[PDB]
Design a binder for this molecule. Structure first.
Ligand SMILES: OC[C@H]1O[C@@H](O[C@H]2[C@H](O)[C@@H](O)[C@H](O)O[C@@H]2CO)[C@H](O)[C@@H](O)[C@@H]1O
Ligand code: TRP
Length: 311
């Protein structure tokens, strides 16, 4: 059942700054086969694979996805799966859809039909995630996302009747917007949110924000994490949905000891609430692995995968 498929997600990591950029490598991370073994050996069971299909699909119907790009996603799915890892395949950045859901609907639903048909025979360790962090017009009217996600789920279910499908709320997958999320009567949904509070800390110096939060911000634990995760757990219980927190992490412009405090505090509370999770992210500016030295960032890795349960 879906609660067990969510538990199987367990501990995971995002392969970020990769296929969700305009093209693979544009944001600094080209995928390598060796990543899968590294990630498995470090104690993770799941890869989250951000994919920004919009750059690679035709603009005119039938909105065909470039075959070479599709083959690269095939490779990532196969290499993770054969090596024992779960993989979450999503639609990630999609500026056009967040800006104009109605105008971009046909293209988005064609993209999902292509993905769903292509991967319909993959095992249950392959999960679909309908849309990363809805925002834009979905923030203005969260019901636009409720309507659209039901359409995309319907498309997926025409070829994948029971695959786990991961769905989050608006506000960039903000748990506070779970209140406005409405989901179909489908027994194989996993609900997701992302956790980056306080943005002033986790995203200090992140240039892709406007405004850019200043750096020099330290962090220690108070009660915000516990309050947030309990709110989300009660929503999940009230609606009988399992939870996967598909991104959390703190950017390298923050001081390391604060980042470690924050990362461990969040991981500990996620697991206390029986949330599966995926850390943002493997190898870039939030990374736990430094490709230049081929070394793990041990303080952060051990905050994710502690050697004793209360550490
Ligand atoms: O550039 C706008 C776009 O950036 C995304 O963040 C990237 C960033 O572009 C990249 O330079 C940096 O190294 O990593 C971050 C995180 O992947 C951001 O996620 C988008 O929301 C934004 O539209
Ligand atoms: N196929 C190309 C060029 C193209 C063909 N028809 C279009 C209509 C609108 C915009 C672009 C196009 C693309 O999708 O970019």
């Amino acid at each position: 059942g879906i609660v067990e498929l969510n538990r199987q997600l367990g501990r995971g990591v995002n392969l970020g700054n990769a296929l969700e950029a305009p093209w693979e490598g544009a944001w600094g991370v080209r995928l390598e086969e060796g990543f899968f073994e590294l990630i498995r050996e470090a104690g993770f069971k799941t890869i989250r694979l951000p994919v920004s299909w919009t750059h690679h699909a035709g603009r005119a119907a039938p909105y065909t996805i470039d075959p070479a790009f599709f083959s690269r996603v095939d490779w990532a799915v196969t290499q993770a799966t054969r090596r024992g890892l779960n993989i979450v395949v999503n639609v990630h950045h999609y500026d056009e859809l967040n800006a104009n859901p109605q105008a971009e609907e046909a293209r988005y639903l064609s993209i999902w039909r292509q993905i769903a048909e292509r991967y319909r025979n993959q095992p249950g360790s392959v999960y679909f995630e309908l849309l990363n962090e809805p925002h834009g017009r979905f923030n203005d009217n969260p019901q636009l996302w409720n309507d659209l996600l039901a359409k995309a789920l319907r498309v997926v279910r025409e070829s994948n009747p029971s695959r786990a499908v991961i769905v989050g709320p608006v506000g960039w997958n903000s748990l506070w917007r779970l209140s406005e999320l409405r989901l179909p009567d489908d027994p194989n949904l996993i609900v997701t949110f992302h956790y980056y509070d306080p943005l002033e800390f986790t995203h200090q110096g992140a240039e892709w924000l406007n405004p850019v939060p200043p750096t020099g911000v330290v962090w220690h634990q108070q009660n915000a994490i516990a309050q947030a995760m309990e709110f989300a757990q009660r929503w999940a219980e009230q609606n009988r949905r399992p939870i996967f927190v598909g991104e959390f992490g703190a950017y390298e412009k923050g001081d390391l000891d604060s980042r470690v405090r924050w990362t461990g505090a969040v991981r500990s509370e996620l697991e206390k609430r029986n949330f599966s999770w995926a850390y943002w992210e493997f190898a870039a500016g939030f990374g736990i692995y430094d490709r230049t030295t081929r070394q793990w960032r041990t303080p952060l890795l051990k905050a994710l995968v502690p050697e004793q349960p209360k550490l």
